Every structure is written in structure tokens, then in C-alpha cells.
């Protein structure tokens, strides 16, 4: 009897039924006969359990416009709320691409907005999970205005509070943007897809032919553009790495990053060597310019896991989160088995929003440093290593988070600057022995500086070392490299409590 | 702000990039990392100075060069202009030459330069127009071209309107028929954060039919890059003032100073044509030469837009120039750092 | 041919001819008819000639509700947009009662959320002019939305910039909130009024006959509640007060007050005596307690003409703006000729709200004072005289602009506290030989003292005076009343540049 309170109450429970199967429970069905998760199951997966909170549940939309009127399913399309994750608090959203595709619309954007502003307001972060076509073409213009307003939202909270894109489903057209001006952007391979336009427009205006997934699949977004920091296996080792990312992190940037329990002194470094510290020893190679992996001098250095970022994408550097006595740190080091280790535009930028996002969330930059130079080319004059390099050089001498550089091996040229050099601002300069720093290598110098295997060999057994930057004080330490990982520790304790806006090149 | 006058060669071509504006004299002046001689042996590529890192390479190809001067002098005239709008810091107002009065109602202002306004858009809306011919009239006396021969397909730089220095960012259909790329987008999103950075309004002239279709755009970071444009203008607090001359669809439509990305003031020309898409593309959806002629003349137009407030005014082109100058003088005194893509 | 260039140019000013009489001209003609101007026609007679932009000039509404989409009139019902008052520039709306009947749905409340958010934005007055019957009950809770977010913007502006409302028809229901939170309210005598609720829900409920005139006019307004701060002769003199009121006020709460051109002094003050000046010497009469009128003070200070506030309202004191030496002041001045000049609650909250407003806006508060003490009775114990008197108290006691305080004759007890004493913070205190300042008259104190007639003058011959108070530095000097005018001049030039919020009694 829907005129008495018991009546009221149970037609609630029926529209909040409903709002889970908002078009048809054979819509879920044919979702879960498919593998994949719903809008909601995939915040129930990612949060606590039990700890979602909804807003907006019975959202309608308010269009008349092309007999939209006779479809307004409850929730208008996007599951959002707030709940925990490791028992701390977050904003989310899921959209829903059984309701009209996942298109954006007025209200669905609006519940988007409602869950930014309260991400904003309590300080705390933004985890979005997109899976939608584009904007919901019936309702006009109005979707525009939603997309600038959401656009708007991650640039006032850009650096301020962490934001995560989940891609979950084709992400197609305008609001593919905000995941971009979010911090971290997550696909799932062979799953997900990210473009503004499609394959159908593409081949009517190019006659390119190419599939959705050859267009914007994670493979494309992580090796190609630059823009995805993670292709996830399938959805739940998705919601994993985003788990992980936000172990790191502080919840804004006014917060400092979560630290586990530091060990106690046992003594002095010499003392407090361990076996993998002792074979860091001997890593570097004889020959001056045989490769070695960067990735075994991170795994002996942290305390556990790396959180790897961008791990398929430019492979001269290594970028990542890691802790190092139970603290927080953000990982930067150059890969002598990928060109080298030299530098690149790739790298650069891969290696510049990294460092950027760790200032912003008051995390310590770790640089591991073996790096001979720019990769020389023609292309990479071109496509802008001037000013894309430029980037890197931006983004350090800006940071104000503790700073550690280690040079393991070659330091050459503006390469060095860029890599951590002390006057650039790096707080502690570390060296290994096998540390060879100087404007170039001992064999192009010798053309310039004697204008021949003898001279070489002079040059580079008086000057291609650590002492001549050590004497300079750019670096305060040449180091055994066991003693690296205790080093970095004493560093970061020590510095545990160090315009409207820059410029930087675009 | 970097003068490049001769070969420029290694790792200090950088501090130039971190400056504001690059200014280099064509064939007599080359900025690289690497020389040619090194990367012969290590690609085996053979290329000149001038190809690898002349004026028109930094210009066209790799968008690092604001502008390639004839001479010398040339280089010299052009910094002096450009610093002629600028203040001397980001605390102080850029400098004004003086005001008009006024002189009554807005028609009764109309010189005959304005009035060619209202006859300057095509009937058909396919058919494009050189966007500096809107410009020219807007302006007072000249305009300084920020990147001329770099992604033509839109069109920066800086000009006074009523004695105010302001940003120009305007599309041009003239190439790629005013399409957002990539190249556009950085040129663009660089020149708004710089007038942002020192105090210059930035008023945009729109007519965007979208971003530029293809592969390549994907592959090569259009979502990452195009964002860039939608950051800075986001980010900004000078005066936003925003004409859209005729299209504006979709995502595009967003970028280009839409009123819910923070634009103040919000104008529109009776061609203006503001939708989610084209009405061809549109009608396949939303429902056949009758069906997209109907989508056309109900719903691309100004109008739904002005309805919900996105545009201020719909306005006769002509009273473009005094509409602006206006709204200047009213929106006259209006984190460590955020994390933009890179 | 609307596919043309010059065809749409045509539509253009087919659709704006149109919004000029959006429900036909008809209506218009029938606003005549009263001797009413429309909704623009307030504006344009307000503003400088030829200054006016509007803006959402064609918006129409969105809503389906109950056959409502049959009609949408262009610029649903009200007027704004900005122009210029002086040269100066201001924003501005003004509601269309032919519209709707003036109700607010969701994009006329738009409309006027665009030019409040311009006007807090650019740092210019806002003015509104109100006429029309409150939310529109065919478009729902919507409506109430829209109020909400203006009501919140005038919150947001409060003591920023500066807020007028002109009530030019009938304004019933929730909106009127809207005038009271803003700086003035300037009402059109018998031709406007504002009710929350209207006569005839009144007799239905409550069974009181009363007309809408009786109910919530001008003079009810005025003199009754407390509310309006000018009853207007006529539409036209409402827009003069207007004008003249901003002429005193800066454009924000960051900006000094307008100065007009200073004079240069010849010499002493003592030898720049006008014959208006000495009439001040022989204006106190001799007999103590003999009613003088306190604008025959004010006129003889002010440069020109005193702007009076709530002049028909609590006229036992008296508030209002004038220059003194080409600079703005607000006077705050006690009237012997009515209670004696007696503080009471409503001369308390008139002054205390004037006070408030003049901080805001930087406007220096001058007090001419003659207070014997507060009305007594046992009313303004029930109805709150101390709980609101208070509110003079903290008024002044927060205010930071130049304080300069005159005793031209009586200042007794805590009303003396009240009126600008030293230890309330006043910067400059001034008293004529006429001042009587004591903790209470001669009379009362007596039988006080020396628990007759004889004791009462010894008293007042001792202790009554301007001297004790002068040797304790509560007055720096005892003055000829005709050097009043060249003394406030110095310390006004002398003076001029000199918590989350608080708790003032409510």
C-alpha cells in the first residue's frame, strides 16, 4: 500500500533491486557469460569488501529529445560512490557500458562530478573506471558541457589528490581526455581500448583500415603513444597493480606517502652487508661497454617489490615505486641493455611526468645512473629531442622530494646533467668506482683534445673516472656498491623533513 | 627569451627549450644535440647541418622555433615586438597604449573593416576562409605570428585590441580544414600557459570540425597530447574570451574555450554550427538526405547552445571587435605544482 | 535563404527583435498601461546610456512539465548582463513579472547565477531588480535548486562586493531571502512589496484580512520591519538613490572608496571658519535636555548632500553616507529628537548593520554622539535588547576602517560604550564643552552617591563634562563644536592608511 510507510519503504527496496540490473537482468547475464564484470562488481572487486558506499543509485536521466524519454534506466548509466581501499579512503566511479553504450549524458556526468568534487573536498583519491562509447549524441550539446566540467576536475585536481584511470571496454571519443589528465592510467590488454575516433570514420576519411584494438589497445597505448602506465593481464590483476600504486601514495598532496616500519642500526654499513648487497660488488662488467641489467641493482636495492610504470614502453629507462627501508620511493634509472642506456624523446617524457608525479605526491627520486649520451638520429632531431628532452631536465630541477643519484657507470655530457647531476639539485651524489663522468668518452675526446689508442687510454685512465667529479664535490661519495642500499637509507632519513605556474616545454 | 645565431651544437641547446620563445635566423643559424658526423657512423644516415637542425626544421618539423627571421636585424626587430606585449614579470600587468572612447551604441561604432566581418563566412559550410582575415580586423594595427610555419592548422600570436595586449588561438580551415592534431594542440596549449605565465588575455577564434583522423595521430599520442591544450586552458586565470566563427563539434568543441572549461565571456556568429558531431555522421545514429537535412537546420546552430547558457551572445560578426575590447575591460582586475602530460 | 551567411544574419535579428516582447508586445503594452517600465527598460534607465550588454538574451526553457513546453518565451523571464553606472562597471539582472509571472525556473535562475558568478569573478557590484511571484511550480524541485544556488552566491559575495536590490513590483514567496542577504534594499513606494507568503494563505490559516500594500510595501517595510533601506517616490528615483549610493562605495572590498578632489587648507582650522561652521558654536541649546535635530550636525559637516539609510525606520538614530573633504564617510549618529536620542533594539541593528557594511566596503565611520542612555521598558527586554543591542557592540568592536567619534552632548553608561568609546578601538575621539559623559545623570546618580537639589547641580557641575573623561584620554580634545568639520578632515587623511569568522549575537 504505497500511501503508508511500510509501503514507501518496501517500494524503495524494489527501485534499489532494480538499480542492479538497471536494463534487463538478462543484460548482466550476457555481460558475465562474456567473462567480464559488471560497472559495479568491478568496484566491488577493487574497494574493501563491504565498504561501498553509492550515490546517486536511482539517477534518471531528464532527455526528451529522439524518444530518449521511454528508456531512463536508474543509475543513468555510471555506478559511483566512495569507500576504502587497505582502509582508506577513495572516490570512485565504474561506468556502465550495457546502458546506452556507456555514453555520457547530462546526469551520468553530473554523478561524475558530484564524485570529483568529493574527492577534491575531502582530500582523497579518484579511481575512474571508463568503458564507454562517447558522448550520448540524443541529449546534444548538454554532454559537451559535462565532459569540459569532468576535463575541468582533473586539471584543479591535477598533482592534488592521486587520480586513476581504469580502462575497462572501448573508451571512444571526447572523454578519453580524462583519463589522460589523470596521474596513472591503467588498460587491460585485448579488453580495452582508448581512442577519439574509430575505425569506421578513420577508413571513410584516410581508406586506413585498422581494428579497434590495432587502433587503441593497450599494446598500442603502452609501446607506441606513451600514454598507458600499465596493460593488465585481465581485470583483477588490473585492479592489483591499481592496489599496489596506491600503497605508494599518499592520499593528496599535503600528506606524506605511507611508510612501513624502519629496521633498527646494527652498527656501520661495512658491518651490515648482506650476500645480494655483496654480489652488487661485483655486477658491473670488466669491459667499460659491455651491457649488464639495471633491473638487478633496483631488486637488490629495495626492500621487496617493484612497482614497474611503463614497463613496455621505452626501455632505455626504468621507471617505478619501490620501497627502501620501508620508505616509499620513486625509481628513475637508465637500461645499458636498450640503446646503451643512452637517453631519448621516449624516455624523457616516459621518465619526466614519472618524476613530476612523485613531487607531486611527496615521493623521493632514486636515480640509478649508466647513461653515454642522447640516441643519435635524424628522427629524434625531428620529432623533438630538444624540446621533449628538455622535459626531464624540467621536471628534476623543479622537484623538491628528497633526491639520491647513483652513478653506476657512464655519465656523459648533458646526458649527466639531466641524470641527477648535483647542480641541477640532487641533494646526495653517490658514485660507483666503476663511475666513468666527463663531457665524452675517452675515445671521441682524443680526436678533439690531441688533434691514438695510447692517448685514448691516457685520457681515460687520468680522467674517465669518479675522482675528478668527486674532487669538484658533484659526487660526496665513491662507493663500494654493496654499501649502496645502507647509503640510500642513511640519505633518506637524513632528508625525511627538507608564480601561478612554470613553463615547461610541451 | 633564446636569439640562435649560428650553429648552436651539444647539450646547451637545452636552456634554449626551457626559455619561453626561440627566435632563429634561417640558414645561418642551426641548433642540434648531435652532429651529423655522429650520426653517420652510428645510423648511417647522411644529413647536413641545415637539414638536421636549420630554422625550417626547428619550425616546421620538430615545433621548437617561435619564429626564422630573414637576417640578423630581422631576428632582433622581432624580439623587440614581441617583448612590446609582455610585461617585464609575471607580476606586473603586460603593458596598454591607451584606450577609446566611446561613442555611443555598438552599431553606431561599425567601421567598414567591421562590417566586412558580417559578409567574411562562406555559404557553404565546407568551403574555408583564410582565418587571419578575422584576425586583422580584430586587431589594432599588426599581428605577431607565434609559429607561423608550424601546424598551420591553427593560428597563435599576439595583437592589441582597444591598446590591451592579447593571446590570438584561433583554428584555421585553410589547413586540414581547422582540424585539431597533435602539432596543433602543443603549439597551442605551450602559447596559452605563456600567456597565462605573463598576464595576456587569450581569445579564441573557433571553427573546429573535430581532431585530424588517422593512425598516426594514435600511434603518436594525440589522447596524451591533445590533452595538453585542455590542461593549459583549464589551468589558466587571465581573461578567457571565446568566438566560435563557425564549427565547433565534440571533443573539439570542449578544447576551444568552451564555457564548462572556464571561458568567461562566450560569443558565437550566426554561422556558428556547435553539435556532438556533423549532422551526416549524427543521423546515422540518431535514427536519409531529408533525415540529416532536418538534424542540420533543428540542431546545428548556435542556438541549442545559447539556450543552456554556453554561449553568452549571439552576435553579427561585425560587433566582434567591440564586444571583445568590452568584456577586456571588465574582466581587467580579475599545490607545489600540478602534473600536466608530458 | 537560411542556408545562407546573410540569411542567418537575418534569423539572428529576427530572434533578438523578438526577445524584446517574448510573450508578445501585447504584454508590453499592458506594462505601460500601469506606467511601468519593462524588465530592460529598469535597466537602461538605470544604467549609462548606450552601456548595456546582454547576455543569455534568447535562452528559452528546457522543461516538459505539464503542457510547459508549449511555451518558451526567448530569455525565460528575466533580463541580464553588465554595463556601466558612472563609468563604472556593474552586473546586472532584472526580472520580467509578464514572464511566468516573474517565478524563477531552472534557466532564469541560470541567467542570473552566470552574472552573480561575473560579477564575484571581476570584483563589480551586482544589482538585481525584483519583481515576480517566486519558483515556478511546473518545473519542481528545480527551481528550488536555482535559489539555493543563489541564495549561496549571495553568501559567497557578502562584505566583497557590493549588493543592491531595487523590489520594482510584487515579490512573493522563497526569493525575497535573496534581497535581504544583499547590502541594500531599495523599495518603489506603492508600487512594490515583498512577502514570503501572500494575503490570502494568511486569511485562509490564520484568519487575518490584509492587503498585499498593508502586508509587505514600501512604508511596512520602512518603518515596521526593518527592512527596506530606501522607500523610492517613483521608479526613477529608486535608479537616482541607486546611482547616488554606488557613487560613495568602491567597486569591492579590495578597492579604497572614490575620492573626490581634497581642497588645500589656509592655515589653522581655527582660521577656516565658514559661517555654517560657527552656527555649530550656538546650535546646542542651553537648556540640557532641550531636543536639537542631529541633521542640522550632519548637513553642516558634509560637503554636499547626506545619502540618508532606513531614514523612516529607528529615528532615534541616524545612518547614512556623505564626503567630507571630498572623501566618502558613513555617519552614525544618535537624534535627541526622538527618545532623546535613546539607544532602543531597532536603532541598535539599523546602526550595527550600516556599521558592518561601511567596514566592508572601507568607508570610514564618523559618530556624532548625544545618547542618554537605552529606551527603558519591558518589551525591549522580551523582544531582545540585549542580545541585540549587542550586535552595535560587535559591529563596532570589529570594524578596522578610520573610527572617528564626536560627543556633542549627552554619552551615559554602557550606551557611552556603544557610541564610539576609546576602549572599543575608536582611532579619534573628539567632545564639545557641551558633553556630558558620566556613568549615569546627575539625578539618578544622587541618590546613588550620597544616600538634593543642591548635590544633583554639584554633580553636574563636578563630574558631568567632557573633562574627566579628557583626562583619562577616552576624548584627545575638547573642541568648538565649529572646528568639528577641519578636525574629522585631518584625522581622515591621517587615518588613511591605516578566525574562520565570528559569532555576532544573530
Redesign the interface.
Known sequence: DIHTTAGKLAELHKRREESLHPVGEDAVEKVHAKGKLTARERIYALLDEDSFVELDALAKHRS?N?NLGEKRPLGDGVVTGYGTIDGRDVCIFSQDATVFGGSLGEVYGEKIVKVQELAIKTGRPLIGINDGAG?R??E??????????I??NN??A???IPQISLIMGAAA?????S???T?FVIMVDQTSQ????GPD??KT??G?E?TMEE??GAH??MA????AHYAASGEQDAFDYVRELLSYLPPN?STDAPRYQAAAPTGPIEENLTDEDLELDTLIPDSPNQPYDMHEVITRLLDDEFLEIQAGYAQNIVVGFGRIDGRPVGIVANQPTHFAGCLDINAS?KA??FV??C??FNIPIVMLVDVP??L???D????????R???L???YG?A?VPKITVITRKAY???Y?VMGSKDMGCDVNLAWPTAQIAVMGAS?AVGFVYRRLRLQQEYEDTLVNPYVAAERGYVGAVIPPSHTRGYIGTALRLLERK????????
Open positions: 526528451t529522439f558522448a549524441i540524443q546534444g550539446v548538454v554532454s559537451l558541457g559535462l565532459y569540459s566540467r576535463f575541468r586539471i584543479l591535477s598533482g592534488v571519443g571526447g572523454h578519453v581526455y583519463p589522460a589528465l596521474d582508448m581512442f577519439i575516433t570514420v578513420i576519411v584516410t586506413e585498422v587502433l587503441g598500442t597505448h607506441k603513444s606513451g600514454t598532496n617524457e619526466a611526468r613530476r608525479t613531487d607531486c649520451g642522447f643519435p638520429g635524424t629524434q632531431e625531428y620529432n623533438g629531442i630538444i624540446r628532452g628538455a622535459k631536465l624540467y621536471a623543479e623538491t655530457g648533458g646526458a646533467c671521441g608564480k601561478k605556474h612554470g613553463n615547461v616545454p610541451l
